[PDB]
Design a protein around this ligand. Structure first.
Ligand SMILES: [Mg+2]
Ligand SMILES: [Mg+2]
Ligand SMILES: [Mg+2]
Ligand SMILES: [Mg+2]
Ligand SMILES: [Mg+2]
Ligand SMILES: [Mg+2]
Ligand SMILES: [Mg+2]
Ligand SMILES: [Mg+2]
Ligand SMILES: [Mg+2]
Ligand SMILES: [Mg+2]
Ligand SMILES: [Mg+2]
Ligand SMILES: [Mg+2]
Ligand SMILES: [Mg+2]
Ligand SMILES: [Mg+2]
Ligand SMILES: [Mg+2]
Ligand SMILES: [Mg+2]
Ligand SMILES: [Mg+2]
Ligand SMILES: [Mg+2]
Ligand SMILES: [Mg+2]
Ligand SMILES: [Mg+2]
Ligand SMILES: [Mg+2]
Ligand SMILES: [Mg+2]
Ligand SMILES: [Mg+2]
Ligand SMILES: [Mg+2]
Ligand SMILES: [Mg+2]
Ligand SMILES: [Mg+2]
Ligand SMILES: [Mg+2]
Ligand SMILES: [Mg+2]
Ligand SMILES: [Mg+2]
Ligand SMILES: [Mg+2]
Ligand SMILES: [Mg+2]
Ligand SMILES: [Mg+2]
Ligand SMILES: [Mg+2]
Ligand SMILES: [Mg+2]
Ligand SMILES: [Mg+2]
Ligand SMILES: [Mg+2]
Ligand SMILES: [Zn+2]
Lengths: 214, 37, 60, 146, 176
RNA sequence: ACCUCGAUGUCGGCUCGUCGCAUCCUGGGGCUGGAGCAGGUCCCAAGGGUUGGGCUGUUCGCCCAUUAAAGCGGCACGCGAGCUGGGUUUAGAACGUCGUGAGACAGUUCGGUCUCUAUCCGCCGCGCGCGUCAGAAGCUUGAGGAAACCUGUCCCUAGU
RNA sequence: GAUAACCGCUGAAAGCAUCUAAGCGGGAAACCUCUUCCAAGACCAGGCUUCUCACCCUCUAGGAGGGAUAAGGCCCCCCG
């Protein structure tokens, strides 16, 4: 029903079309993934599949985590995350210890990507929320770039909780929707995303079958 | 839909009925149908 | 009122019956008894219902 | 000196009440009276003296009039213009227990002792309950005649 | 009320079973069930008549007596014989046809219009200009009639659209 | 003239919004003196959006070119412990008028110091302590909050 | 999915008639989900596994105080 798989961004490039065009493509290394858990509604309250990825030496992994992996029946992995299903028909095909690779996706189908946006730092109001600066001339008095007025006076005499102003951006989960997959492989699990996805080089991204059009 | 607080049986055949606390007049003559509101 | 409702009578009816019976005991002692002797309340409510008239809605 | 409750002289009991076809106002008023404990002669307002009360079948509450569509339950999340509107019909369709919970919390004291009394009310929707281990005594609301 | 005083006759080839407040009708054309209002009671006269009774002379009983009587009469007569409503498709370039249980209407739209036929209703086309619907429940027959009629907006100028057998739409013309 | 003359800073512009619907478009309906398009009017509807310029300190207003529109209002005629002093609103000078005269003129014309290192509430983000009942690591379901919600043109049906 | 306005069906009070008071329904950028993020400090503080699951002393035997441990954590290092 709904497919998904984890991946890693290493670069971002372009590839050529059969319609003779050129399309930018994001390198996504969807390395091999192993099923470490199954979630059943009667025993837990929902249906989902938990996946682990990466290679970590057995001594760098925390001992309870290593024990949990041994109980699951697979060697230790780097990061762990789950994919949520919606019916037990898709649940029944997944079993503990099963291995998933990138060929499960067929080219021509939209995909959705989820990752952590870049760490931009504590930024000003105008850069963050796209405000407009005032004149840097005509007698400005050191308020060149700072927002200014916030609300009424003595009624309500406050700020309107939720007002858009200064704060740190980035370093949070961000999703991009309805993306081309241009080309997939079977050899070493490399998946291609036409466009630009959020995250970092050598960062963590998860790709899921598109909900919008699929 | 002539919406006005006062509604009357304009012709000899317009008919007044009651719906959801609003009384409206209906007639096969199209304009004679209105609600009071 | 709590004790009266436990003994299946209302506060107003209990007080009116008590006044009709002519008992001058005050709410301090009634409350201490309610904390203390449900036997005392059983006797008291019995007296109150005995002193209660036939019909409460009579024009009298 | 008058009587006041001591540390451990307080006693608790477990009551279970079915809510099938019972009027919301009457049921909730009786429940509030029971949780405050006005049924014991050892009532004292500065300490809790009531009993634990469990209500069953919160989705079977019956209310009179056309309020099934013309009564609204209001709350505001916090932002300006964040006022949101839902009806009793939608409330029982989505979370049946919320209506009884709100009705009872509305008549309990709105102080910290009141919300401490609120701590001891169990409200469920289904006909079963995992508190059969405490052998609650079934309770039927009755009126004294005079 | 006034009609409710008149008992509903029961034809011989119709079986009626009653259990408390729920009532059902058995006949050649099928089975149907309904529930009647609580305050009023209904009884089966031994001579083959339906007797409906109201307990008081109050508003609800007075209203519901006639409602129950006429509903039961309609139910029993529809179950014994049945119900047909026929329509006329007048206009130019207007085409109607039936395949299987579905109906396709070429009503001038750029896309074809398909309507799914509910359970317990039948459709039969005689001409591409007029067809008829046959069924057992006045509720479903009227529901289908209204649904079909509401495909086209009223046209008081050219008579374009759909209408029943005797339905008349007033004629009006503009000089401009 | 009831609060403020042991101080409630004033019009406009910039930035920043919020709320109501008596709605500008977009959405759904009733009627026509609605052949069709093209209309007029009334109802429901606040989800979203609602031009840029020339002129003047302007608000307003006139004009220029589109779009779907270039909404009405409330929020100390929103907002100077956020910014501007263009005018009103000091001290110069001058014009015209009034007054024999000092001076004045909701008449005009030129330039004329806008201070404050955030205590609390509030807010945008990030941290320390504590409990969730032996102690720890993961994955989480999720009540409950937030974000977003706009739209134009062309071709077929059919020049029927 | 339920609704505003609107359009219906069988229908009486009132032999008729009637979208409605019993009932059965269609019906929009509004409303509830569907999309995305936060989210068990949600005090009903939720759920499933994994890991160490016993060494004492003291006051006086009612409990309490102090020490010695594992899993794990922290410090510190190079850094992003
Ligand atoms: Mg940006
Ligand atoms: Mg700028
Ligand atoms: Mg500067
Ligand atoms: Mg208070
Ligand atoms: Mg005064
Ligand atoms: Mg004063
Ligand atoms: Mg001052
Ligand atoms: Mg001010
Ligand atoms: Mg000012
Ligand atoms: Mg309006
Ligand atoms: Mg319109
Ligand atoms: Mg009009
Ligand atoms: Mg509006
Ligand atoms: Mg919106
Ligand atoms: Mg200008
Ligand atoms: Mg305002
Ligand atoms: Mg102001
Ligand atoms: Mg404002
Ligand atoms: Mg203002
Ligand atoms: Mg300041
Ligand atoms: Mg300040
Ligand atoms: Mg001047
Ligand atoms: Mg000035
Ligand atoms: Mg001067
Ligand atoms: Mg002169
Ligand atoms: Mg002179
Ligand atoms: Mg002089
Ligand atoms: Mg100068
Ligand atoms: Mg100044
Ligand atoms: Mg300063
Ligand atoms: Mg400060
Ligand atoms: Mg939620
Ligand atoms: Mg009628
Ligand atoms: Mg009719
Ligand atoms: Mg917890
Ligand atoms: Mg350690
Ligand atoms: Zn008329």
């Amino acid at each position: 029903a709904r497919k998904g798989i984890l991946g890693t961004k290493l670069g971002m490039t372009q590839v050529f079309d059969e319609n003779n065009k050129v399309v930018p493509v994001t390198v996504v290394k969807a390395g091999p993934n192993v099923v470490t858990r199954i979630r059943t509604t009667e025993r837990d309250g929902y249906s989902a599949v938990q996946l682990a990825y990466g290679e970590i030496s057995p001594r760098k992994v925390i001992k309870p985590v290593a024990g949990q992996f041994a109980a699951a029946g697979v060697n230790p992995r780097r990061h762990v995350a789950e994919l949520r299903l919606d019916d037990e028909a898709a649940v029944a095909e997944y079993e503990v210890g099963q291995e998933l690779t990138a060929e499960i996706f067929s080219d021509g189908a939209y995909v959705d990507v989820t990752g952590t946006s870049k760490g931009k730092g504590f930024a000003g109001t105008m850069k963050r929320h796209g405000f407009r600066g005032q004149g840097a001339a005509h007698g400005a008095q050191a308020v060149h770039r700072r927002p200014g007025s916030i609300g009424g006076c003595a009624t309500p005499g406050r700020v309107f909780k939720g007002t858009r102003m200064s704060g740190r951006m980035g370093n949070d989960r961000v999703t991009t929707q309805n993306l081309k997959v241009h080309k997939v492989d079977a050899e070493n699990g490399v998946l291609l995303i036409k466009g630009a996805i959020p995250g970092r080089n050598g960062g963590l991204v998860v790709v899921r079958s598109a909900i919008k059009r699929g | 839909m002539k919406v006005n607080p006062s509604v009357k049986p304009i012709c000899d055949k317009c008919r007044v009925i009651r719906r959801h606390g609003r009384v409206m007049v209906i007639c096969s003559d199209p304009r004679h149908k209105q609600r009071q509101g | 009122n709590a004790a009266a409702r436990a003994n299946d009578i209302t506060y107003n009816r209990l007080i009116q019956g008590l006044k009709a019976a002519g008992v001058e005991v005050d709410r301090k002692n009634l409350a201490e008894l309610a904390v203390s002797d449900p036997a005392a309340f059983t006797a008291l409510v019995d007296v109150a219902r005995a002193a209660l008239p036939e019909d409460v809605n009579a024009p009298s | 000196p008058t009587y006041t409750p001591k540390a451990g002289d307080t006693t608790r009991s477990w009551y279970v009440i079915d809510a099938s076809d019972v009027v919301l106002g009457r049921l909730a008023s009786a429940a509030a009276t029971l949780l405050r404990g006005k049924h014991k002669p050892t009532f004292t307002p500065n300490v809790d003296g009531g009993d634990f009360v469990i209500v069953i079948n919160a989705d079977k509450i019956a209310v009179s009039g056309d309020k099934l569509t013309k009564k609204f339950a209001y709350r505001h999340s916090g932002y300006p213009g964040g006022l949101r509107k839902r009806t009793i019909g939608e409330l029982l369709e989505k979370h049946p227990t919320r209506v009884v919970e709100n009705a009872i919390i509305g008549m309990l004291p709105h102080n910290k002792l009141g919300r401490q009394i609120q701590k001891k009310l169990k409200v469920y929707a289904g006909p079963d309950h995992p508190h059969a281990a405490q052998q609650p005594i079934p309770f039927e609301i009755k009126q004294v005649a005079q | 009320s006034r009609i409710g005083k008149q008992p509903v006759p029961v034809p011989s080839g119709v079986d009626v079973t009653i259990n408390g407040q729920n009532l059902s009708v058995k006949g050649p054309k099928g089975t149907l069930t309904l529930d009647v209002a609580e305050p009023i009671s209904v009884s089966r006269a031994e001579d083959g008549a339906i007797v409906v009774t109201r307990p008081d002379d109050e508003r609800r009983s007075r209203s519901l007596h006639g409602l129950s009587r006429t509903l039961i009469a309609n139910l029993v007569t529809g179950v014994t014989e049945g119900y047909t409503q026929k329509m006329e498709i007048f206009g130019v370039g207007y085409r109607v046809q039936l395949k299987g249980q579905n109906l396709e209407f070429a009503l001038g739209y750029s896309h074809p219009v398909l309507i799914e036929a509910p359970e317990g209703i039948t459709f039969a086309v005689e001409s591409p200009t007029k067809f008829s619907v046959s069924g057992i429940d006045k509720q479903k027959v009227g529901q289908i009639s209204a649904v079909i009629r509401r495909l086209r907006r009223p046209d008081p100028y050219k008579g374009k659209g759909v209408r029943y057998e005797g339905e008349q739409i007033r004629r009006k013309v503009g000089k401009t």
